Write a protein that binds this DNA or RNA. Structure first.
Lengths: 61, 68
DNA sequence: CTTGCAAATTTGCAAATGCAT
DNA sequence: GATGCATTTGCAAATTTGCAA
């Protein structure tokens, strides 16, 4: 993947939220959108996984 | 038109822990910002929208090194 | 899936250091 | 002493976190 656009973002608070979005998305794909196991493989709480999905607008296809 | 060459971050998506990749990205991001402004801390902290005090604390935490 | 709450982490703002001129 | 800076730090508020619902 080309993630060159993250480095073009002027403000850090945006880049941190864009990366965190793309990162989780790719994880959701690698685990066929099995939330329970994703929040486990990345080391967070499932309750916090849902929260990140609502905030960053992630589509659980 | 020419565009500057950017770093390849295809490995950040390979990191296993989310918490881990957030530190690594934040590190690479700040580093590139330092270079782009030739390591002018005061200005870098302004362009990215954080307090200079935090910028120092981030450099300390992420073990970022400066030129001069 | 969402929610509470308390702890843990981070932020901004100022103030206070150092550190040479 | 003083003056310019560039690092540090002391809180309190903001934020994110885990966990048990």
């Amino acid at each position: 993947r080309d993630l060159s656009y993250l480095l073009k973002i002027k403000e850090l608070k945006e880049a941190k939220k864009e990366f965190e979005k793309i990162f989780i998305e790719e994880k959701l794909r690698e685990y066929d959108y099995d939330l329970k196991r994703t929040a486990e493989e990345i080391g967070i709480d499932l309750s916090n996984l849902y929260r990140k999905i609502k905030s960053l607008n992630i589509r659980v296809k």
